[PDB]
């Protein structure tokens with residue numbers, strides 16, 4: 001067989017060769033003891049890994065039959081009875097140490113990209129610094145009304161509104177003692193503080209401490225760096241430029257620190273179903289931790305006059321492993337059982353990250369000596385304990401000190417939401433953030449209460465009582481554990497990549513709730529979301545909330561049951577079957593784990609496996625209570641399958657041959673058998689069908 005024999009494992013050759021030729025050299029770990037640890041850890045941990053998965057199926061099975069009989073008094077008592085709801089520990093504080101300042105202190109956007117896409121990943125690590133002019137001019141933040149519409153050449157009417165918008169931002173972030181940046185006619189620093197020239201007057205910063213440094217001669221600085229809320233603002237002064245020649249202070253651009261941290265993703269935004277897929281990922285992740293990823297390059301750090309100092313130039317990177325559910329046949333055991341993909345990610349992504357700790361690739365990742373892993377889709381504290389013990393064992397195999405691997409706990413399952421304090425206590429010496437995964441969180445809420453009744457519509461979940469408590473309950477728990485100045489309190493993702501006007505308008509709510517950070521789709525959306533953290537003082541908002549328990553158990557357990565006309569239904573099912581179809585074609589046919597599919601209302605939504613978990617779970621729920629039928633679902637399936645194809649070279653249509661499309665027939669499975677996946681997860685059906693398409697295409 002092609003696989004390579006090591007203890008009780010048969011490792012696919014391509015993985016085995018990658019780890020030996022690319023990963024291990026540099027880490028001073030002997031390739032034979034490394035594989036010995038791998039075989040040993042896997043054999044050690046697979047049992048209670050599988051035990052925990054059975055506990056999900058068991059706890060769930062109790063809930064399902066409960067609702068086909070049975071109103072929160074009996075319910076809450078029954079959940080704590082069966083071990084779902086567990087006791088709350090005593091108040092405590094996290095002890096995680098040696099964490100980069102990006103996570104303990106700075107507040108600001110958090111970006112997520114698929115790690116299998118290298119040029120995206122390059123742009124994301126490069127996204128710690130972003131032009132504000134390009135994000136304002138490039139999007140709908142400036143309305144494309146009047147004579148300010150983007151064209152094939154640069155539009156100057158639009159250009160000055162960019163400048164005026166940024167001039168205002170400068171006024172509301174770094175105030176002058178008297179006057180406005182819009183009437184600014186010169187910049188210079190004389191005797192250590194910057195003097196801004198005005199028409200008649202000359203004024204300085206109201207707080208002269210927000211001056212951080214500059215480029216060029218202090219006479220005619222090529223730029224001036226400013227700080228506010230720990231976030232850096234660079235004004236590039238070069239009147240040579242096209243934009244510089246027009247601006248009344250020679251200003252070329254306004255650059256904001258944008259992507260403070262990025263999350264390189266191995267889970268819901270990627271398709272990776274055999275050992276060849278994971279190694280493109282792993283190779284990209286290795287390319288980043290070395291600092292030699294190219295397609296062009298990672299950018300270097302930036303230097304300033306204060307003498308000279310220097311700032312980070314790339315976004316500090318996390319990785320997101322997969323959770324505890326899926327297996328992957330990149331490794332099989334002697335009788336053929338696929339090995340748990342969560343354990344593989346920890347060993348392999350961990351080993352790789354030793355390179356992002358040294359320079360001999362040239363570029364360092366963590367300056368405090370930590371490795372940052374996000375663990376999605378945990379179900380309770382005991383699942384957190386296991387991830388901890390798993391990381392502790394990987395550390396031994398890899399020879400690094402205990403607790404180098406830190407956790408990014410994802411509050412995206414119901415059983416961790418109501419036991420959140422127990423969860424963070426479990427990781428208490430490794431946690432570096434908690435984050436409301438509200439899409440994954442919504443799919444669990446539906447699948448957990450599937451037998452309770454018909455669910456409210458998808459749009460309506462945004463305002464349901466459970467969700468609102470869930471968002472405030474997380475911030476409560478974080479601050480009560482010491483997260484301020486220690487660990488990020490993080491919130492969820494803006495999916496609408498073309499509505500930056502609405503994003504700039506409404507996403508301010510998240511930092512106003514005390515979020516240290518929130519998730520972004522793009523380097524551009526990251527820059528705009530950064531405007532929100534110059535407005536709101538996240539650190540001050542956090543202190544106004546400590547103690548304030550604005551949420552109880554009963555608000556978290558309120559199930560979004562409904563109580564609709566035959567227009568509101570046919571519009572929901574069609575809407576759903578369209579975003580399911582449009583995501584799954586690119587998923588099954590091309591191994592693309594994230595795509596922008598316009599919903600029914602011509603809104604470009606960025607989909608992943610969480611959003612598809614909500615959609616398919618939803619129809620699934622409406623089918624189980626007879627809101628609609630199987631043939632009605634099939635109708636909307638066939639109704640829209642022509643539409644995504646015109647909405648979509650080297651691509652495969654779906655209509656009229658619905659039987660002969662593994663992508664179409666997968667989407668149909670995802671709904672019609674939707675209810676029977678463990679916790680409504682979508683990896684099984686997607687992984688079996690992705691591998692199927694490959695198998696046909698190889699014949």
Ligand SMILES: O=C(O)/C(O)=C/C(=O)c1ccc(O)cc1Br
Pocket residue numbers: 112265268269376410412436437438439440441492493495606607608610611
């Ligand atoms: O809230 C969650 O479930 C969470 O973890 C976020 C995502 O997984 C995600 C959702 C949509 C999207 O377009 C990109 C992503 Br990265």
Ligand SMILES: [Mg+2]
Pocket residue numbers: 268376410412437439440441610
């Ligand atoms: Mg999620």
Ligand SMILES: [Mg+2]
Pocket residue numbers: 537
């Ligand atoms: Mg302030």
